[PDB]
Amino acid sequence: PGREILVLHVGQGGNQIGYNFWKTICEEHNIDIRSNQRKSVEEDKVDYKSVFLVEAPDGFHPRALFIDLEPLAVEFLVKEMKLGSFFSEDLMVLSYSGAHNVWSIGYQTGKKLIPVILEKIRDTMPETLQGFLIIHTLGGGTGSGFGSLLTETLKKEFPGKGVLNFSVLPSEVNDVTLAPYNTVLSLNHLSRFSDLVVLFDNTALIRIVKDQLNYPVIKQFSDLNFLIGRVMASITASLRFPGPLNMDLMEMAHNLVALPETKFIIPSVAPLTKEESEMSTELDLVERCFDPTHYMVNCSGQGKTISSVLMFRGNIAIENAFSIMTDIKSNVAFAPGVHPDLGLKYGICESAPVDFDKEVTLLSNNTIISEVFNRVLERFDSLFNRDWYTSDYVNAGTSKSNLKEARDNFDRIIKIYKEIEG
Ligand SMILES: Nc1nc2c(ncn2[C@@H]2O[C@H](COP(=O)(O)OP(=O)(O)OP(=O)(O)O)[C@@H](O)[C@H]2O)c(=O)[nH]1
Ligand code: NA
Ligand code: NA
């Protein structure tokens, strides 16, 4: 036993993303998410299902908790996707009142549910658990505030285990006017308590779906969240399937986090379609990953890479993987202090994602985060300097001084990234 991970889904976005993640994980392991059973013995592959899946005599179950302060997003999702026997009731921690898009309400109200969450974790977690993934949006109130509280709680309650966040930033025009407050408060908390924060935003995700997958229409978030699930699944594939070069969660974090504060990561994946996977080279896929068209955070350009992790999945020519390294280092901009021989961390897994020939996933620690975060800060200041929308933060235990303290620590992180940029 070992390497087990527990996934916490928080708020509407966090749980809706959970559907796509768990659908992907079950598909990769030949598990029928509706029967809880292997689809067949003959197509059962040599693998390590226990990373994300709990095998019981009756079948397989997600090592997950489904957490929200209001019940509708989760209940409607479970009904629509027919997930009742997989997202089972004993894995849900739901209240009734909602956070009303205020981080502070999410944080305060979430405290009441922490005892039940810790008891559920300690009831079923193996002692060799390697860590936790928290899936949440930052612009609402529950994912942001309760998600922040959970990050703090787990890091305090389980020292020595990894806490990783998969976190959705607001879109280029925010669709929650309070999102700058919720985002600054969340990123301040994750800077204090997370080990690694992998970021996404819907402007980038919509651009990828319309321009790389050419979907005619996006009617449900499941036709966006699949990209987040793909990143989550591919970066953990070498924990779950054979391959020449495997890597675990903190191995990836250690290679990425050059200074303690630089833990905010931009992900990308290539190719997005099966047809492209059959007509591309390792070099072509890596170049796509390093191109802003494939970044899952909306960026103005390539930025400067401090450190990166590349996962090669599937039908990979190892000599191409290694020989293109000088080309990556020459063609992609890296931060001034990065030695020509450094800044790359490789995993190589023999398992391709569903029906693809091969796939590359990139996690980049990139100075361009400063531009992304500065835009959040500019939005924050436009509200805070006018004292707009602060009342319900103050009423729920976040004083105006506290908001300012979170802003100023956020700015300090931004300046660290900008300084590395040169
Ligand atoms: N990518 C993605 N974004 C989502 C999803 N659901 C909500 N969002 C975005 O998340 C932000 C709003 O956060 P929600 O998750 O709806 O809020 P919540 O965490 O449930 O918090 P409250 O509703 O305030 O209690 C907005 O920017 C939404 O566009 C989702 O399933 N996928
Ligand atoms: Na909600
Ligand atoms: Na909401």
XYZ file of C-alpha atoms and ligand atoms in Angstrom:
456
model
C 0.000 0.000 0.000
C 0.983 3.609 -0.608
C 0.758 6.590 -2.951
C -2.995 6.948 -2.252
C -4.587 10.356 -2.914
C -7.856 11.804 -1.570
C -9.706 14.383 -3.676
C -11.908 17.116 -2.133
C -14.393 18.835 -4.466
C -15.617 22.188 -3.104
C -18.547 24.333 -4.324
C -20.428 24.256 -7.625
C -17.439 24.400 -9.941
C -15.290 22.047 -7.871
C -17.936 19.301 -7.840
C -18.925 19.742 -11.497
C -15.226 19.343 -12.405
C -15.257 16.205 -10.261
C -17.692 14.542 -12.634
C -15.281 14.887 -15.544
C -12.233 13.888 -13.466
C -13.814 10.736 -12.104
C -15.286 9.779 -15.483
C -11.763 10.032 -16.942
C -10.142 8.037 -14.115
C -12.711 5.243 -14.403
C -12.285 5.104 -18.190
C -8.482 4.901 -17.910
C -8.783 1.946 -15.521
C -11.511 0.079 -17.506
C -14.031 0.668 -14.651
C -17.724 1.203 -15.397
C -18.624 4.287 -13.342
C -22.295 3.149 -13.279
C -21.810 -0.443 -12.120
C -18.679 0.231 -9.993
C -17.166 -2.885 -11.670
C -14.367 -3.644 -14.085
C -15.779 -3.724 -17.601
C -13.951 -7.036 -18.220
C -11.157 -9.211 -16.890
C -9.519 -9.494 -20.320
C -9.086 -5.726 -20.812
C -8.050 -5.132 -17.216
C -4.591 -3.636 -17.615
C -1.558 -3.871 -15.360
C -2.087 -0.759 -13.267
C -2.305 0.689 -9.768
C -5.968 1.492 -9.235
C -5.585 2.426 -5.581
C -4.122 5.891 -6.309
C -7.643 7.269 -6.708
C -9.969 4.263 -6.380
C -11.000 2.271 -3.325
C -11.680 -1.389 -4.091
C -14.371 -2.879 -1.876
C -15.893 -6.355 -2.257
C -18.862 -4.783 -4.068
C -16.811 -2.701 -6.506
C -14.770 0.480 -6.875
C -15.443 3.837 -5.237
C -13.772 7.248 -5.564
C -11.481 8.316 -2.775
C -13.243 11.663 -2.737
C -15.446 13.989 -0.707
C -18.157 16.097 -2.387
C -18.460 19.304 -0.364
C -20.764 22.287 -0.765
C -22.718 24.735 1.361
C -25.819 24.395 -0.847
C -27.154 21.071 -2.178
C -28.398 21.804 -5.718
C -25.230 21.730 -7.859
C -24.196 18.329 -6.479
C -27.673 16.807 -6.308
C -28.580 17.892 -9.858
C -25.210 16.686 -11.160
C -25.585 13.252 -9.577
C -29.114 12.850 -10.974
C -28.260 14.043 -14.484
C -25.083 12.003 -14.826
C -26.578 8.929 -13.096
C -23.755 8.883 -10.545
C -25.797 7.759 -7.524
C -23.772 4.615 -6.804
C -20.373 6.265 -7.386
C -20.832 9.744 -5.879
C -22.524 8.038 -2.988
C -24.283 9.727 -0.066
C -21.584 8.777 2.469
C -19.088 10.846 0.443
C -21.180 14.027 0.510
C -20.809 16.847 3.020
C -23.603 19.275 2.086
C -25.309 22.107 3.944
C -28.334 24.208 2.924
C -27.645 27.983 3.128
C -24.957 28.891 0.496
C -22.000 31.276 0.733
C -23.692 33.934 -1.475
C -20.392 34.520 -3.327
C -18.594 35.866 -0.226
C -15.303 34.154 0.674
C -15.771 35.053 4.345
C -19.180 33.351 4.533
C -17.702 30.259 2.878
C -14.823 30.268 5.366
C -16.897 30.870 8.522
C -19.769 28.556 7.595
C -17.369 25.842 6.476
C -15.905 25.664 9.994
C -19.097 23.999 11.201
C -18.496 21.088 8.822
C -14.752 20.593 9.469
C -15.336 18.022 12.279
C -17.422 15.794 9.974
C -14.891 16.139 7.163
C -11.944 15.201 9.373
C -13.860 12.232 10.749
C -14.700 10.976 7.253
C -11.073 11.416 6.195
C -9.690 9.642 9.239
C -12.305 6.866 8.870
C -11.190 5.743 5.413
C -7.749 7.204 4.626
C -4.856 4.706 4.544
C -1.871 5.703 6.633
C 0.334 5.698 3.543
C -1.825 8.395 1.935
C 0.498 10.670 0.014
C -1.724 13.748 0.021
C -4.847 15.637 -0.992
C -6.114 17.398 -4.116
C -8.576 20.249 -3.562
C -10.685 21.151 -6.626
C -12.440 24.521 -6.489
C -13.175 27.815 -8.148
C -11.785 30.991 -6.660
C -14.386 33.530 -7.782
C -17.427 32.216 -5.875
C -17.767 31.969 -2.110
C -17.729 28.263 -1.173
C -14.959 26.937 -3.401
C -12.979 30.054 -2.547
C -13.618 30.413 1.194
C -14.374 26.846 2.248
C -11.667 25.675 -0.189
C -9.187 28.017 1.495
C -10.273 26.772 4.922
C -9.802 23.158 3.805
C -6.311 23.904 2.458
C -5.337 25.413 5.826
C -7.014 22.609 7.793
C -5.425 19.709 5.946
C -1.959 21.232 6.002
C -2.293 21.755 9.764
C -3.978 18.407 10.565
C -1.819 16.195 8.281
C 1.743 17.478 8.230
C 3.942 15.490 5.919
C 1.163 14.894 3.379
C 0.924 16.922 0.195
C -1.823 19.498 -0.270
C -2.270 20.432 -3.947
C -4.897 22.823 -5.290
C -6.543 22.770 -8.718
C -8.022 26.244 -8.806
C -10.179 28.091 -11.344
C -9.438 31.810 -11.719
C -12.091 34.283 -12.905
C -12.618 34.894 -16.623
C -11.162 37.929 -18.395
C -14.398 39.745 -17.646
C -15.403 38.328 -14.272
C -18.827 36.700 -14.069
C -18.963 37.387 -10.305
C -18.452 41.049 -9.451
C -17.099 40.015 -6.015
C -14.520 37.688 -7.606
C -11.491 40.002 -7.022
C -12.068 39.872 -3.262
C -12.654 36.122 -3.273
C -9.654 35.474 -5.535
C -7.216 37.615 -3.523
C -8.359 36.051 -0.242
C -8.029 32.521 -1.708
C -4.638 33.062 -3.319
C -3.339 34.612 -0.087
C -4.519 31.538 1.820
C -3.126 29.076 -0.717
C 0.192 30.918 -0.739
C 0.359 30.255 2.993
C -0.881 26.671 3.105
C -0.798 24.940 -0.304
C 2.185 23.012 -1.598
C 1.361 23.677 -5.264
C -1.465 25.542 -6.987
C -2.390 24.532 -10.542
C -4.469 27.312 -12.136
C -7.102 27.448 -14.897
C -9.511 30.054 -16.201
C -12.610 29.811 -18.334
C -11.471 32.327 -20.939
C -8.526 30.068 -21.816
C -10.629 26.899 -21.540
C -13.349 28.218 -23.856
C -10.711 29.352 -26.336
C -9.149 25.870 -26.374
C -12.498 24.102 -26.836
C -13.620 26.353 -29.659
C -10.215 26.642 -31.413
C -8.562 23.255 -30.818
C -11.523 20.883 -30.442
C -13.804 22.966 -32.691
C -16.879 22.095 -30.655
C -19.901 23.725 -32.337
C -21.394 24.734 -28.981
C -20.718 24.461 -25.248
C -24.086 23.687 -23.643
C -22.878 22.328 -20.268
C -19.747 22.799 -18.180
C -18.918 19.152 -18.853
C -17.853 20.332 -22.329
C -15.254 22.578 -20.598
C -14.276 20.772 -17.396
C -12.976 17.759 -19.316
C -9.789 19.756 -19.918
C -9.178 20.118 -16.184
C -9.848 16.412 -15.696
C -7.364 15.595 -18.477
C -4.600 17.547 -16.711
C -5.383 15.927 -13.368
C -5.408 12.457 -14.892
C -2.328 12.826 -17.103
C -0.029 14.301 -14.498
C -0.825 11.368 -12.210
C -0.643 8.692 -14.917
C 2.830 7.453 -13.978
C 1.485 6.667 -10.473
C -1.210 4.487 -12.040
C 0.323 2.757 -15.099
C 3.714 1.304 -16.103
C 6.361 3.454 -17.645
C 10.065 4.187 -17.939
C 10.171 7.256 -15.677
C 7.598 7.780 -12.933
C 7.014 10.754 -10.641
C 4.780 11.491 -7.648
C 3.069 14.656 -6.410
C 5.801 16.138 -4.247
C 8.453 15.061 -6.746
C 6.766 17.345 -9.261
C 6.321 20.140 -6.715
C 9.972 19.947 -5.643
C 11.137 20.329 -9.248
C 8.813 23.301 -9.838
C 9.088 25.409 -6.674
C 12.344 27.324 -7.085
C 11.628 29.721 -4.189
C 9.069 28.906 -1.480
C 6.621 31.498 -2.821
C 6.754 30.434 -6.486
C 4.124 27.684 -6.308
C 1.539 28.943 -8.857
C 1.497 26.773 -11.989
C 0.007 27.111 -15.500
C -0.934 23.806 -17.153
C -1.319 22.856 -20.799
C -1.913 19.672 -22.805
C -1.362 18.603 -26.404
C -2.877 17.365 -28.598
C -6.572 17.943 -27.886
C -7.929 15.359 -30.400
C -7.290 11.727 -31.337
C -6.706 12.677 -34.995
C -3.948 15.114 -34.011
C -2.368 12.502 -31.706
C -1.833 10.238 -34.721
C -0.269 13.027 -36.865
C 2.206 14.801 -34.551
C 5.745 14.408 -33.192
C 7.065 14.710 -29.636
C 8.644 18.018 -30.645
C 5.395 19.325 -32.152
C 3.412 18.418 -29.017
C 5.914 20.040 -26.640
C 5.983 23.216 -28.739
C 2.179 23.325 -28.603
C 2.255 22.979 -24.803
C 4.632 25.920 -24.574
C 2.443 28.011 -26.857
C -0.062 30.417 -25.243
C -2.855 29.008 -27.473
C -2.650 25.861 -25.330
C -2.177 27.505 -21.898
C -5.195 26.906 -19.665
C -4.673 30.335 -18.061
C -5.356 33.328 -20.305
C -1.920 34.933 -20.925
C -0.672 37.698 -23.223
C 2.366 35.736 -24.353
C 4.841 32.981 -23.599
C 6.326 34.735 -20.526
C 9.525 33.286 -19.055
C 9.585 29.737 -17.736
C 11.274 29.241 -14.378
C 10.777 25.473 -14.235
C 8.567 22.934 -15.974
C 7.347 19.374 -15.672
C 6.487 17.468 -18.845
C 4.572 14.189 -18.732
C 4.907 12.108 -21.907
C 2.116 9.533 -22.220
C 1.713 6.718 -24.675
C 3.603 5.846 -27.851
C 6.661 7.986 -27.023
C 10.035 7.676 -28.717
C 12.383 8.167 -25.756
C 15.217 9.336 -28.004
C 12.957 12.100 -29.310
C 11.906 13.083 -25.784
C 15.558 13.600 -24.809
C 16.950 14.903 -28.076
C 14.427 17.751 -28.325
C 15.528 19.162 -24.964
C 18.133 21.501 -26.490
C 15.450 22.694 -28.930
C 13.001 23.379 -26.094
C 15.656 25.282 -24.183
C 16.553 27.285 -27.306
C 13.075 28.004 -28.692
C 11.181 28.682 -25.421
C 11.986 31.688 -23.242
C 13.245 30.778 -19.768
C 13.895 33.127 -16.864
C 17.383 34.765 -16.897
C 18.760 32.687 -14.063
C 17.831 29.284 -15.573
C 20.946 27.447 -16.723
C 20.801 26.186 -20.360
C 20.814 22.577 -19.041
C 18.083 23.048 -16.413
C 14.379 23.771 -15.983
C 12.891 20.473 -17.277
C 11.525 17.555 -15.277
C 10.347 14.484 -17.208
C 7.869 11.718 -16.559
C 7.257 9.040 -19.179
C 4.237 6.735 -18.959
C 3.327 3.999 -21.418
C -0.422 4.527 -21.003
C -2.015 6.851 -23.600
C -5.204 8.747 -22.716
C -8.425 7.317 -24.130
C -7.956 6.373 -27.817
C -4.985 8.749 -28.294
C -1.654 7.611 -29.679
C 0.376 9.903 -27.400
C -0.062 13.045 -25.308
C 2.123 15.641 -23.557
C 1.063 17.549 -20.431
C 3.021 20.583 -19.265
C 3.080 22.187 -15.815
C 4.883 25.507 -16.067
C 6.107 27.760 -13.297
C 6.139 30.927 -15.379
C 6.825 34.588 -14.566
C 3.738 35.567 -16.602
C 1.745 34.663 -13.483
C 2.706 38.169 -12.356
C 0.662 39.616 -15.242
C -2.296 37.371 -14.456
C -2.162 38.213 -10.764
C -1.609 41.944 -11.405
C -4.868 42.063 -13.345
C -6.643 40.478 -10.354
C -4.998 43.038 -8.098
C -6.085 45.912 -10.354
C -9.677 44.634 -10.141
C -9.362 44.290 -6.363
C -8.111 47.874 -6.002
C -10.946 49.268 -8.143
C -13.439 47.917 -5.589
C -11.493 48.284 -2.360
C -10.421 51.878 -2.971
C -14.138 52.795 -3.206
C -15.187 50.581 -0.257
C -17.522 48.764 -2.642
C -19.019 45.385 -1.628
C -17.061 45.145 1.638
C -20.023 44.996 4.087
C -20.703 41.281 3.937
C -17.001 40.430 4.237
C -16.834 42.573 7.377
C -20.042 41.044 8.742
C -18.528 37.545 8.348
C -15.215 38.181 10.109
C -12.932 39.638 7.391
C -12.286 43.226 8.363
C -11.353 45.919 5.864
C -7.877 45.772 7.415
C -7.838 41.995 6.796
C -8.788 42.478 3.141
C -5.900 44.944 2.819
C -3.464 42.545 4.519
C -4.418 39.785 2.067
C -3.999 42.175 -0.867
C -0.573 43.294 0.297
C 0.713 39.740 0.742
C -0.647 38.905 -2.716
C 1.307 41.853 -4.123
C 4.462 40.535 -2.448
C 4.096 37.229 -4.341
C 3.562 39.128 -7.594
C 6.746 41.078 -7.024
C 8.744 37.880 -6.393
C 7.685 36.539 -9.797
C 8.397 39.870 -11.475
C 11.870 40.045 -9.926
C 12.723 36.557 -11.238
C 11.577 37.737 -14.657
C 14.440 40.244 -14.543
N -14.582 25.871 -15.262
C -15.666 25.865 -14.481
N -16.064 27.024 -13.852
C -17.165 27.023 -13.060
C -17.923 25.885 -12.879
N -18.957 26.199 -12.051
C -18.844 27.501 -11.696
N -17.753 28.030 -12.350
C -17.183 29.372 -12.229
O -16.926 29.511 -10.843
C -17.170 30.852 -10.432
C -18.339 30.883 -9.451
O -18.069 29.913 -8.473
P -19.073 28.726 -8.033
O -18.317 27.444 -8.056
O -20.352 28.761 -8.844
O -19.365 29.195 -6.535
P -19.374 28.286 -5.223
O -18.008 27.778 -4.883
O -20.399 27.185 -5.318
O -19.709 29.395 -4.112
P -21.158 30.020 -3.767
O -22.165 29.727 -4.868
O -20.945 31.493 -3.599
O -21.542 29.450 -2.432
C -17.587 31.632 -11.648
O -16.452 32.323 -12.153
C -18.109 30.525 -12.544
O -18.104 30.843 -13.907
C -17.536 24.715 -13.525
O -18.190 23.680 -13.393
N -16.409 24.713 -14.316
Na -22.726 27.482 -5.349
Na -23.637 30.321 -6.879
